[PDB]
């Protein structure tokens, strides 16, 4: 059902990187594989993904560059599953790299943070069946 190097869970296929990329390069990579950065739709999917994270910060398909949080596939953010770290998202500017923080990633414990999109983090692709 899933292609080789992809993991099947509950009607999605997932691919977990062994490397890091900026958020935009990871979403380009997922799109080239007819997929997208992972969209977390439920607690059960959050638990599956967080269980197999490669012990490093990992991008997901959630960003707010135009001002509101959006999932790459159009899943509604505000009515959807959320799993932020305490005090996140904060759009922090104190990194001094310019602007705030517009891309969401997993901490190893599975809780989410907004960070600078240009950081090379691991990522997860997802595609339907
Ligand atoms: Ca590898
Ligand atoms: Ca999903
Ligand atoms: Ca499961
Ligand atoms: Ca932001
Ligand atoms: Ca952490
Ligand atoms: Ca943050
Ligand atoms: Cl939350
Ligand atoms: Cl950013
Ligand atoms: Cl960095
Ligand atoms: Cl899809
Ligand atoms: Cl999907
Ligand atoms: Zn999808």
Curated annotation (Swiss-Prot):
Binding-site residues for Ca(2+) 2, renumbered to this chain: 39, 41, 45, 126
Disulfide bridges in this chain: 2-13, 30-125, 103-117
Binding site for Ca(2+) 1: 90, 101, 113-114
Residues given in the record as a glycoprotein binding sites: 88, 90, 101, 107, 113
Function (record text): C-type lectin receptor involved in recognition of N-acetylgalactosamine (GalNAc)-terminated glycans by myeloid antigen presenting cells (APCs). Binds in a Ca(2+)-dependent manner to alpha- and beta-linked GalNAc residues on glycoprotein and glycolipid antigens, including alphaGalNAc- and Galbeta1->3GalNAc-O-Ser/Thr also known as Tn and T antigens, LacdiNAc epitope GalNAcbeta1->4GlcNAc and its derivative GalNAcbeta1->4-(Fucalpha1->3)GlcNAc, O-linked core 5 and 6 glycans, and GM2 and GD2 gangliosides. Acts as a signaling receptor at the interface of APC-T cell interactions.
Subunit structure: Interacts with A-, B- and C-domain containing PTPRC/CD45 isoforms: isoform 1/CD45ABC, isoform 3/CD45AB, isoform 5/CD45BC and isoform 7/CD45B. Does not interact with PTPRC/CD45 isoform 2/CD45RO, a memory T cell marker.
Record-given protein name: C-type lectin domain family 10 member A
Naturally occurring in which organism (per UniProt): Homo sapiens (Human)
Lineage: Eukaryota, Metazoa, Chordata, Craniata, Vertebrata
Residues of the full protein shown: 181 to 308 of 316
